[PDB]
Amino acid sequence: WRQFQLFENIPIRDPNFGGDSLLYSDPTLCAATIVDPQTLIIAVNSNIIKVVKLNQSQVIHEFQSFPHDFQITFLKVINGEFLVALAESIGKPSLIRVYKLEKLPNREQLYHSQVELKNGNNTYPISVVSISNDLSCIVVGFINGKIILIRGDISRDRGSQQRIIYEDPSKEPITALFLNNDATACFAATTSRILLFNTTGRNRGRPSLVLNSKNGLDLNCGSFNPATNEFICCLSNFIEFFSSSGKKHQFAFDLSLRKRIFCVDKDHILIVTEETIINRIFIIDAKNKIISLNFVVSSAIIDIFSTSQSGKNITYLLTSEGVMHRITPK
């Protein structure tokens, strides 16, 4: 595998680092998502949401979005129109709150729509979430192996129906969950199985396809490619590609130290590995079978997200010491 420098990595540390108005270097930051190359949304102080304009280094909106005893664990921007936030509090049902980006509220009781997620004694953390582009289909996976399917006209706040569609018999965590492009199926994995569920909720708690009956995925080792409608599965010794019909191809790769993967664009996969403890970041050109970028970061990765509004896909690596790496093709 030949290495080339076909992407540019520009590490940017929070310009407010060291002062009294921290942005994405806030040491309490628990979730982050990007709206466009100029706009970052973060969650700090357990349940405060802040809109950050990067080119100005300023918070332009902020509010408490959940009650005092809740912790935000996921933020997602859906279709450039909605902010979706999930928050948990042990022993209580988790909450999904949906907002309109253009009209964000100023206090915790105001939200466009809400989903309440019950799961047993509610001590089991959420592990994965996938949301369709119109918000009518949501899947949530948990550490005890439960998957909940939510359907309904949530974008206009007309209520939702919920259905448990999987309870892993061995109570293994759900480690990947991705809706396909028309959200008729959801790719899923545990640590020891790779699965597909149709999203009709008529499945008796059973998968529609067993994609890999012998191995699963570690956390963050699945990703999804919209351009090809494929589940990308990073195992220890190879990467597998699954379509909604079970169609399958793969290639060998030494991924013993894998921590995390991310679909960069149609052809490229970003791979995070652990090294002596630092993180090495590769980009693989799965089409031409080359390494297109290779660098290291000295800090844990909080999250990886993407923008496309500037004429190309930019990949952002948010680090836990307030450096955001911006990765751009040349």
**Cβ atoms 327, 9 nearer than 8 A:** yes
CA–CA dist 265, 224 (Å, integer): 10
CA–CA dist 44, 23 (Å, integer): 9
CB-side exposure of 277: number of CA atoms within 13 Å?
7
Sign of CA dihedral 166, 167, 170, 173: positive
User: Which residues make beta-bridge pairs with 302?
Assistant: none
DSSP letters along 275-328, please? E--EEEEEEEETTTTEEEEEEEESS-EEEEEEE-TTSS-EEEEEETTSEEEEEE
112 phi-psi bin (left φ>0, alpha ψ -120 to 50, beta other) = alpha
DSSP letters along 97-137, please? EEEETTB--SSTT--SEEEEE--TTS-SPEEEEEE-TTSSE
**Cβ atoms 258, 236 nearer than 8 A:** yes
**Cβ atoms 119, 144 nearer than 8 A:** yes
CA–CA dist 105, 100 (Å, integer): 9
CA–CA dist 86, 65 (Å, integer): 10
Listed in sequence order, the residues at least 6 apart from 54 whose beta carbon sits closer than 8 Å to its beta carbon are 37, 38, 39, 40
CA–CA dist 107, 202 (Å, integer): 39
Q: Would you tell me how many other CB atoms lie within 10 Å of the CB of residue 97?
A: 22
CA–CA dist 88, 95 (Å, integer): 7
**Cβ atoms 130, 78 nearer than 8 A:** no
**Cβ atoms 228, 266 nearer than 8 A:** yes
Sign of CA dihedral 77, 22, 296, 255: negative
Per domain, the residue ranges of the chain are 7-329
Sequence length of the chain is 330
CA–CA dist 114, 99 (Å, integer): 9
Cβ burial 179-216 (10 Å sphere, 16+ → b, else e)? bbbebebbbbbbbebbbbbbbeeeeeeebbbebbeebb
| Sheet of 71-78, strand order | 71-78, 82-89, 92-100, 113-117
Question: What CATH architecture does domain 7-329 belong to?
Answer: 7 Propeller (2.130)
SS3 157: coil
**Cβ atoms 175, 195 nearer than 8 A:** no
CA–CA dist 163, 255 (Å, integer): 36
Secondary structure string (H, E, C) spanning 211-226 = EECCCCCCCCCEEEEC
**Pair of tokens at residue 294:** 């290779």
The two counts, helices (H) then strands (E), for the chain are: 0, 28
Cβ burial 108-118 (10 Å sphere, 16+ → b, else e)? beebbbebebe
The DSSP element (H or E) to which 61 belongs, if any, is strand 58-64
**Pair of tokens at residue 141:** 């996976």
214 phi-psi bin (left φ>0, alpha ψ -120 to 50, beta other) = alpha
Q: Long-range contact list for 127-130, CB < 8 A, 24+ apart?
A: 127/173, 127/174, 127/175, 127/219, 128/174, 128/175, 128/176, 128/177, 129/74, 129/76, 129/86, 129/177, 130/177, 130/178, 130/179, 130/186
User: Which residues make beta-bridge pairs with 232?
Assistant: 223, 241
**Cβ atoms 2, 316 nearer than 8 A:** no
The single-letter code of the amino acid at 253 is F
Beta strands in 203-267 (DSSP E): 209-212, 222-225, 230-234, 238-243, 248-252, 258-263
Q: Would you tell me how many other CB atoms lie within 10 Å of the CB of residue 279?
A: 20
